[PDB]
Symmetry: C2
Subunit: 315 residues, 2 copies
């Protein structure tokens, strides 16, 4: 069985939920995890003892003053006059949501220093992070998505002037998770606040149509060798297992697979879909879902181990 | 009076060209360049004496046994008797072509470490490094490109089957730059050679129609504040330089005028450039490479770190650089 390393924290709007994921993965992985590496907002790495990996320790994480590590080839590094002490780290699991983990910075940085990992690489991160780019990627793959307007602080007034709006619609930043800046607009006075709130998260905002009580379906999965290993379908807002045709389930899996291509190799991704007049629409790609969507897999621990092992790793 | 570091080398097929780029900019910029940072194929950072910046020294570089520095917040980590000593870097000029400068990796490292730089950020790097991604980006912007077929290894044996246009073809890696692995294919005898030779440089190959008698024009430039600062138009294959017409003339012409393209065409080249460099290349000096087919402007590619930062295409490059440096937040 593979030894692991869990990376979490990050300079991110999803910092706090990253710690939840890593704490969740502790219950799943237990002893399989050699190291717990915390990445704080100032971009310092710290080693956390397995006994300290709980909510109480992290609320008071400042006072603690841990000794900052510096990333280097094959692992982590501590300095003194005597030289550099190198902690050689095993296959790391990127559990940093948003910010550094999903925008491509960490994929680049881990890849730079030849540290093997589970998570989206640079291209996969960039395209899944920016929703506008996700739309172009999907479009090219013949996978449907909701029509949209991409706005920025510049064209803001120009594009919305002389306009008689067709309500409702949904306003969201071009690149963020957990719905941090996402508001529904039903009337024109509701618009300013929706746009201002979404611009607090991103230079660019996406306006899409709103259709309430539409079917939402989430599928997690990864590629191991030449086959795919899927999770159960989630019905995220309902209320466990989701009720679906064999044929719908199969449409979702087909879409997932086109999306994943070779881009998302080495990652456990969840694609979120809409079903409108029973057509499948791609909502988004979460290449680092909360707790790696472990609770949606029949045998997550074995799926992980199977993926880890199929990696062409080589330090 | 801004100072720069020049970062060059890298794990790139264009490693040698990057060294040439840094020697050229030494020549141009001089001792504004406070530091010269070498990155080798094994990803160690070395500091190099300005006096050692030349072909002869780099021809033997692998034996000079230099002391590797480690990148960290605000610069490079050196050790002393007092422990970690930080060498703070002035604005770095990313001159690592191709692998590691143009693929998003060094952009992420410098951003991660709060190290100010001139060059493409992460999205710009990614979107301009992968020629298939550039094709998708150009399309959404309304910019013309040649049609193509994208090939994998698990799929390359089906090449002719998937082709939706005729011979002749031009075959090229998805991401290699510097005319590396590029072959013109006239007939499917030559196709197996062109393919296995470009798959030497990438997991993906792009196939395009080869079209004869196409005008090639390259345009370099950057955004400074709310204005573009353009270079001369390069014609890579004659090696002549054509510049733009001014409607706001402040001199009387006393000689036979100089060799320019039409007002319409100069305008299109600039328009394609601006919409391409949108907000995604802010902080970079890029060269877009265009084809003109029957009067139309098509994009061949975006090069966010051109060779020698395309400095010989600018009127005053030091002033252009400096003003870009100044405008950065």
């Amino acid at each position: 069985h593979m030894e692991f390393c869990v990376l979490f924290g990050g300079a991110s709007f999803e910092h706090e939920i990253s710690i939840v994921s890593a704490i969740a993965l502790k219950g799943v992985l237990k002893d399989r995890i050699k190291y717990f590496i915390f990445l704080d907002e100032n971009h310092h790495f710290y080693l956390i003892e397995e006994s300290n990996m709980h909510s109480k320790y992290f609320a008071q994480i400042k006072e603690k003053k841990l000794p900052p590590l510096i990333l280097t080839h094959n692992g982590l590094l501590k300095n003194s006059f005597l030289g550099a002490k190198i902690i050689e780290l095993p296959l790391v699991i990127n559990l940093v949501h948003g910010g550094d983990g999903e925008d491509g910075k960490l994929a680049s940085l881990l890849e730079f220093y030849r540290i093997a990992f589970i998570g989206p690489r640079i291209e996969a991160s960039v395209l899944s992070y920016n929703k506008y780019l996700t739309k172009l990627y999907a479009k090219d793959l013949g996978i449907k998505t909701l029509d949209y307007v991409l706005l920025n602080e510049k064209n803001r007034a120009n594009a919305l002037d002389l306009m008689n709006f067709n309500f409702p619609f949904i306003v969201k930043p071009s690149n963020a998770g957990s719905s941090l800046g996402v508001n529904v607009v039903k009337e024109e006075k509701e618009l300013i606040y929706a746009l201002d709130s979404a611009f607090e998260y991103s230079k660019e905002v996406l306006i899409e149509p709103f259709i309430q009580g539409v079917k939402e379906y989430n599928l997690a999965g990864c590629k191991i060798k030449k086959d795919f290993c899927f999770s159960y379908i989630e019905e995220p807002n309902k209320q466990p297992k989701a009720s679906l045709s064999n044929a719908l389930e199969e449409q979702l899996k087909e879409n997932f697979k086109k999306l994943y291509s070779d881009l998302f190799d080495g990652a456990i991704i969840r694609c979120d879909f809409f079903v409108i007049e029973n057509e499948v629409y791609l909502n988004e790609i979460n290449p680092i879902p909360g707790s790696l969507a472990n609770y949606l897999f029949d045998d997550f621990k074995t799926t992980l181990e199977n993926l880890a092992q199929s990696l062409p790793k080589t330090p």
